Amino acid sequence: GKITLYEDRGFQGRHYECSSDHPNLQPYLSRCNSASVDSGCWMLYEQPNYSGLQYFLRRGDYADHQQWMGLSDSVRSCRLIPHSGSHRIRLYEREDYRGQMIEFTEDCSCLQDRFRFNEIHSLNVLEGSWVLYELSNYRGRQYLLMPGDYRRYQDWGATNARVGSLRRVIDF
């Protein structure tokens, strides 16, 4: 992976280049208003050490922070999301993997059309990395999901169990 982050809109300003996870961009960028992803799938973080609001970026050029649904120009850490060769996630109605369950291996732009629950209370990421979105059509707050067990919604760093869309992390 390779990403170049720019302090200013339109690929202007001081810039910094990453080819791996960086938990602290603060010494190098004071802000981030544009970015170019040469390769790989990236998660940008509002705060240092992969915390605060999260934003998914793929190969492409982003001329302003709105193009990645950024609420601000604050980007203080970033992660290169590992390649995965397959994707499978299970969502559950209730915590600790109880209640109704649905299993996806592909993207879903509207969860409520497949699984009539506004909220997901636990989920099992069997394969691959995914991005949960609060709202349908890949809008709202984003949560990166790596393989593993998520017995409650706090486990994926959300303040609520709302989920409206879900996307596989795939690098073109």
Numbering used by the authors: 1 to 172
Give verbatim lines from the article:
The room-temperature serial synchrotron crystallographic (SSX) structure of freshly prepared crystallin mutant (R36S) shows no post-translational modifications. Here, we present crystal structures of freshly prepared HGDm (fresh dataset), HGDm aged for 9 months in dark conditions (aged dataset), and similarly aged HGDm during exposure to UV (light dataset). Crystals were prepared with 20 mM dithiothreitol (DTT), a sulfur-containing reducing agent with a similar function to that which GSH is expected to perform in vivo. In our structures, the fresh HGDm crystals incurred an average diffraction-weighted dose (DWD)28 of 0.19 MGy after 20 ms X-ray exposure. Fo-Fo difference maps calculated between the first and last timepoint revealed no peaks above 3.0 r.m.s.d., confirming that X-ray-induced damage was not responsible for the absence of Cys-DTT in the fresh HGDm structure. The solvent accessibility and pKa of the three surface cysteine residues were calculated from the fresh structure using PropKa331 and PyPka32. Both methods predicted the pKa of C110 to be lower than that of C41 and C108.
